[PDB]
Each structure stands twice: as structure tokens, then as C-alpha cells.
């Protein structure tokens, strides 16, 4: 079906303890493939998937230079936003950014996204027209007028419509064995004791999109097994049947607890 | 590949 490439950034200021901690990661669909952490001795963008290691040094140097420039831009933004919100320089604050592009099975661009948060709340975001901003408060409106003046969206829109799609198309080709294959779950049900519980399990599946009494049912968040696979279970307190729907499954499987 | 953009807030 459809695919995606995303880049996540996080800068957390550390007052009196030095320069802010910067961590950025890159995802194709739900697969991590690149990272950069400022808390390393020699900070460089490092690979996290086999299909990305084939890139030459001109790729990794550019990725490292862009990560370091974003860490520098964030350090200035932290101090700038203290002025905007009139906050003390003694407190830790967090700037998050996410940007990326959604492509369909045909390879064209479905949606481009670029959004920033400050202390966990939305700050400014590129609208889906890739041409206008929505700022969350009057301080973000300061950023918005500066970003409109400097024609920031023009570059974002060119990247999301152009470079983002082209490289996502390349990544899926070089990693078609791991990025375009869907691993179905390994479902089983257990019983935990005039009252008891039935637990519908789903283990080792990719991608993360999985569907398992919409009131009394207890459903945990999808968790990674640590080996690129995922897990999920649901519980309720023969007359019960848990529905299992996944893209890697031939049919939506229904299962009852075999005693 | 990553976006090349310098845009202070």
C-alpha cells in the first residue's frame, strides 16, 4: 500500500549543564534507519538498517552536517522562545520537530508534513497546501511572519514534493525485502482466573498497524519486540471472540480461547 | 535524505 518517510528531532535544553541534548531519528514506514545524538564524543549520523549502509561518504557527511545545523538552529530557538514567552533561563525546555512525506502505491506524493512543538504543545505547522502556516499562539505568529517573509515554505514545498519523494522511492527499492514485506502476527489466547479474563495476543508483526465490547475491553499500546517486530494484546473480563485484522494476513482472523 | 533548511523561529 502507501509508504512514508519521516524525520523526528528533539532538543532538550540543559541549563548550567552545557548545550542542549539533540536527538534525531529517521524512519521509513515503521523502520528506523538513521540516528544522530549530540551526546557522542564525535557526533555523526549513523546507520540503523542494512539498505542504508550502501550510501557513500557524500551522503553521510551531508546528513551529519544537516543534523548539526538543526542542533544549532534549535539552540538559538530555545533562547529565542524564552524571550517570546518571557521564561527564565534556568528551566529546561523541549523543542520537537517532525517533517516528512506520504507516498502511495503509485509513488506520487499524498501529503507533506512539517510541524514544530514547544514543551509538548503545537507551536507552528505547515498546512497541507505546503504554502501557508497555522501558528498556535501569538509567539508562533512572530515566527510565522518571519517564516513567510523569508519564503520558508517555498523550500519545504519543493523538498516535500521533490527530494523527499525521490529518496523514499529509492529506499523502498534497496530494502524491498524488509520494507515491502508484511509479517503476519502469531496469535494465541490465554486464560487468567466466578470471574476471569481472556487475553487475545498478537506477536511478531510488521508494520505496526494492527486491530484487536468496545467499553470493557482493555487494549495496550502497540509495543516493539526489540527486533523490528511488534506486540499487542487485548483482554476482557466461548461467547467471546477477538477480531484480528492485519495487512500481512490473508483474511481477518477470528479466534476463541481453545480451553 | 534530510531536508536542508535553516529557519530560526
Amino acid at each position, epitope marked *: 500500500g502507501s509508504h512514508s518517510m519521516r524525520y523526528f528531532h528533539t532538543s532538550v535544553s540543559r541549563p548550567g549543564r552545557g548545550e542542549p541534548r539533540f536527538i534525531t531519528v529517521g524512519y521509513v514506514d515503521d523502520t528506523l534507519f538513521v540516528r544522530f545524538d549530540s551526546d557522542a564524543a564525535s557526533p555523526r549520523e549513523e546507520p540503523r538498517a542494512p539498505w542504508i549502509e550502501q550510501e557513500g561518504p*557524500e551522503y553521510w*557527511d*551531508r546528513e551529519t*552536517q544537516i543534523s548539526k*545545523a538543526k542542533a544549532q538552529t534549535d539552540r538559538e530557538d530555545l533562547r529565542t522562545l524564552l524571550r517570546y514567552y518571557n521564561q527564565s533561563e534556568a528551566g529546561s525546555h523541549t523543542l520537537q520537530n517532525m517533517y516528512g512525506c506520504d507516498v502511495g502505491p503509485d509513488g506520487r506524493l499524498l501529503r507533506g508534513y512539517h510541524q514544530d512543538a514547544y514543551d509538548g504543545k503545537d507551536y507552528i505547522a505547515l498546512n497541507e497546501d505546503l504554502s501557508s502556516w497555522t501558528a498556535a499562539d501569538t509567539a508562533a505568529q512572530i515566527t510565522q511572519r*518571519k517564516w513567510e*517573509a*523569508a*519564503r*520558508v515554505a*517555498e*523550500q519545504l514545498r*519543493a*523538498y516535500l514534493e*521533490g*527530494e523527499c519523494v525521490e529518496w523514499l522511492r529509492r529506499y523502498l527499492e534497496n530494502g524491498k525485502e524488509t520494507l515491502q514485506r508484511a509479517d503476519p502476527p502469531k496469535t494465541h489466547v490465554t486464560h487468567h482466573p466466578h470471574e476471569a479474563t481472556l487475553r487475545c495476543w498478537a506477536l511478531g508483526f510488521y508494520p505496526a498497524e494492527i486491530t484487536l465490547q468496545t467499553q470493557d475491553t482493555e487494549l495496550v499500546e502497540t509495543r516493539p519486540a526489540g527486533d523490528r517486530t511488534f506486540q499487542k494484546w487485548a483482554a476482557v473480563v466461548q461467547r467471546y471472540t477477538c477480531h484480528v485484522q492485519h495487512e500481512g494476513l490473508p483474511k481477518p482472523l477470528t479466534l476463541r480461547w481453545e480451553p | 535524505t534530510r*531536508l*536542508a*533548511l*535553516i*529557519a*530560526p523561529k
Partner: T-cell receptor
Amino acid sequence: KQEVTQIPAALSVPEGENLVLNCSFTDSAIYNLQWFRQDPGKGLTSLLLIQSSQREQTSGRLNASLDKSSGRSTLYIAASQPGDSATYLCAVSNFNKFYFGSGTKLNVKP
Amino acid sequence: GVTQTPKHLITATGQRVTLRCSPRSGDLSVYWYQQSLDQGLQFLIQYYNGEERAKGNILERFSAQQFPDLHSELNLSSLELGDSALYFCASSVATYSTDTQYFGPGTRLTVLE
């Protein structure tokens, strides 16, 4: 490592002629590419700014292209006018470094 | 827009000169460039809101600074004949990679023996 070269170094043409000014660069990890005109008294004036991911820009009779993969930029000047006589320089912005090319000195004869 | 001072400058070797620049109102970033015949337009140094941000191949005997009022100074000391060139000041709103710079008229320096 960045080396920006321009061709031709000079150009003397009749007015009304479509002009092709070429720019080349060796490092493709740029933030933008610009075309400036320099007049002896007024200094440099930006004409077109092509964003990193953009492939072309346009402003009136001016139209420039950008190909980061091959490291080339072409400025097109439609129907040149005597007021276009100046020096045309392409500029690239790299990581913490700005580079200018040798420039094309253009004289549009009336 | 951007203004520079002096416009022209005749000096002798070994001397020291100060080039001044007042950027566009509201611009936080200032840039210095040296345009010579054998090297063309070469980027010297960039200041951003008082902090040095970027440097080209600026000589050890070249010294620059941005002041709290955003106006910039370029000191060229122990001058040589090769220092003869046009020195340009530019300014920009800030550091946007998507925005352009705005150049001043330039200072013309000729150093004679």
C-alpha cells in the same frame, strides 16, 4: 572543496537576443543558488534565488534552472535590453561557507 | 539599505584601516566580502546579532566585529599591495537559508608602496 565556475567570462550581444549564462559547482550540498548582477557603482543585487530543492525560478525576462545532481545552473535572459548590461555572478550557499563564481560580464549593444 | 564608509581609501603599506558598515534597518546578520581580480568575490566573515557565525579564508591580520547597534567594523592591519580590492558589506534579516543578502556600495582600497 566548492569550486564555482562560470561560462562565458564575457558576452557582447545585440539587444533583443536571448542569452544563456552557465554556472557550475562541485559540491551539491547547497542551501540555495543565487544569481546577482553587479553594476560598478551600486554593488551586487540579487536577481533570482533558487531554493535547495527547487529546480527553477522566474522573474520577468529572467529564468534560471538548478540541477544539484550534476552541479549546474543555467540563467536564461529573454530579449536582452541595454539596461541588462552588468556582471552576472552565480552564488552558492554551503555549510557555513558562501562561494561566488568568476562571473559573466554582459554588454547589450543597442 | 546598506551603507559603507569610507567609499574610497588610498593608503600605504604596513598601515591599518577600519571599514565601517551600517546594515539595513532590522537586519541582524552582516557579511564582509573581498573582491579582487585574482580571486574574485571571496567571503570573509559573517556576524549574526553580535556573534561571529561563519568565516571564509579570512587573513590572520584581518579583524572584524558586530556591535550591539548591529553596525559592523572591519579592521585591515599590516596592509600589503595585495590587499588592494573592493570590500563589500552585505546584510540579511537573519540566517534564513531561503532568503537573500543585500549588498552595500562597497569600499575601494588601493595600497601603494
